[PDB]
Nucleic acid binder design. Structure first.
Ligand SMILES: [Cl-]
Ligand SMILES: [Cl-]
Ligand SMILES: [Cl-]
Ligand SMILES: [Mg+2]
Ligand SMILES: [Mg+2]
Ligand code: NA
Ligand code: NA
Ligand code: NA
Length: 330
DNA sequence: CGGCA
DNA sequence: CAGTGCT
DNA sequence: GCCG
DNA sequence: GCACTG
């Protein structure tokens, strides 16, 4: 259980005794990430969380290696930072990295697109604006480049959730709407608003996206759509852009998912996160012959759907102590 | 060796 | 399909 | 990158 | 681990 972050309270990270190491490893992790070396970046991310939650400063190679998520290679970097006070590799990061980061912060452009733009000789967002072929999504991402990098005060997230909730409950008063993600984890600021909608009767959630989105469009609240498959009525998620009325308002990212009540606990767990919390819990489930998604906790395929009326039941079935949302902030 | 949700 | 983004 |  | 695009 010591190996599994989902088995531990994330508040362990608030007392980071190894910041002089993790702040340097994070620069490298991001460099690998924007260049597309996702599995190396993942190992760094896990090592960083292991160091942030360790109970004391790491002071020896043998100690480092004993920490789950720290291997020989990561231990060698820790020992270099201890003795020398710096990590040499930080002076030998590819020169493309700042531009690759700039480009991949465009919503809809990932590492593959950023690398292509870089190969084509683009170096600034002015180059992208004037010379790149953008997808519909990437054009919206570029238009809102600064705003999508800003976090909003949680009070604004509340107002956005209430806007969605009021529009939804106007045509079915029994709909349940809950803000998840970083909001539900109690953070003071939110990168976007994640709204989960369901109905306790098990059926009235169906078909509401069309009416809800059109209602939110009628009042001008939705300003741009990033992902919204509205043609066949099977839509599960909406990803888009909103802006509250009045002066001093920024465009904000809004994600909505509509789910059947029978999947409420698993959808709430998924959408509350954190992302690394979810990945940890899902990896653990695999070791127990199970698979965890936003739909269900199931047994391995030939599977059976296990009964999970509440988040606590998912924890229980995986042998984990329950964590309130604020303690899932990995 | 291969997954890493 | 490859690429992307959600947590 | 680290893990089993 | 899944739901999207083109
Ligand atoms: Cl590099
Ligand atoms: Cl009603
Ligand atoms: Cl619950
Ligand atoms: Mg969010
Ligand atoms: Mg979101
Ligand atoms: Na280790
Ligand atoms: Na991006
Ligand atoms: Na974010």
């Amino acid at each position: 259980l010591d190996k599994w972050v989902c088995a531990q309270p994330s508040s362990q990270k608030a007392t980071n005794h190894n910041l002089h190491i993790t702040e340097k490893l994070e620069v490298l992790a991001k460099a690998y990430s924007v260049q597309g070396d996702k599995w190396r970046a993942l190992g760094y991310a896990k090592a960083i969380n292991a160091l942030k939650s360790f109970h004391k400063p790491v002071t020896s190679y043998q100690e480092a290696c004993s920490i789950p998520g720290i291997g020989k290679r990561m231990a060698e970097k820790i020992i270099e930072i201890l003795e020398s006070g710096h990590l040499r590799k930080l002076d030998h990061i590819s020169e493309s990295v700042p531009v690759l980061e700039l480009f991949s912060n465009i919503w809809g452009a990932g590492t593959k697109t950023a690398q292509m733009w870089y190969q084509q000789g683009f170096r600034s967002l002015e180059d992208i604006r004037s010379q790149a072929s953008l997808t519909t999504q990437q054009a919206i991402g570029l238009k809102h480049y600064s705003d999508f990098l800003e976090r909003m005060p949680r009070e604004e997230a509340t107002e956005i959730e209430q806007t969605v909730q009021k529009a939804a409950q106007a045509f079915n008063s029994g709909l349940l709407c809950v803000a998840c993600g970083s909001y539900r984890r109690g953070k003071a600021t939110c990168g976007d608003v994640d709204v989960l909608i369901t109905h306790p009767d098990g059926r009235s959630h169906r078909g509401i996206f069309s009416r809800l989105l059109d209602s939110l469009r009628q009042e001008g609240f939705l300003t741009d759509d990033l992902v919204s498959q509205e043609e066949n009525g099977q839509q599960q998620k909406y990803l888009g852009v909103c802006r509250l009325p009045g002066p001093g308002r920024r465009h904000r990212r809004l994600d909505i998912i509509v789910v059947p009540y029978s999947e409420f606990a698993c959808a709430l767990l998924y959408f509350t996160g954190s992302a690394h919390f979810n990945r940890s819990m899902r990896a653990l489930a695999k070791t127990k012959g199970m698979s965890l998604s936003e739909h269900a906790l199931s047994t391995a395929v030939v599977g059976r759907v296990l009964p999970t009326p509440t988040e606590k039941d998912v924890f229980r079935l995986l042998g984990l102590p329950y964590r309130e949302p604020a303690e899932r902030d990995w």
